[PDB]
Amino acid sequence: PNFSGNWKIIRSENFEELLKVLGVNVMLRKIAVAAASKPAVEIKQEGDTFYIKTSTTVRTTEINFKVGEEFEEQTVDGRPCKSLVKWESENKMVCEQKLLKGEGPKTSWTLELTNDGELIETMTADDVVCTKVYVRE
């Protein structure tokens, strides 16, 4: 699959609830789910090597990884973690995360490219799943 593109969000389900069950305070949740925080996602894929930039009005997040090689990022609540992405199937990657410091809920994410070119993202903490869907600009 080729995940490359500039992706715009078209569906978001259970995001604030994920943050809430994770202990994020209401002032921060409000900011995090406001229109000003609507994420635009740029992906550059070169085979198994990925660059993913997520942009909001106030923040840029950039990750660089190759499938099967450990890399650093932050969990959805901003805690540094060691991440590892594997292909679950031809069109879907899954990332396992390990906190660099301390214990905490089991967090993960996935990205899947559909036949008609939609991008499905999931983010999980224990038994709570958030789903976002994007289309290319």
Ligand SMILES: *C/C=C(C)/C=C/C=C1/N(C)c2ccccc2C1(C)C
């Ligand atoms: C993951 C989702 C985030 C960070 C924010 C999304 C915010 C919104 N808002 C405020 C909104 C309003 C109408 C329709 C869609 C949305 C969206 C989910 C993008």
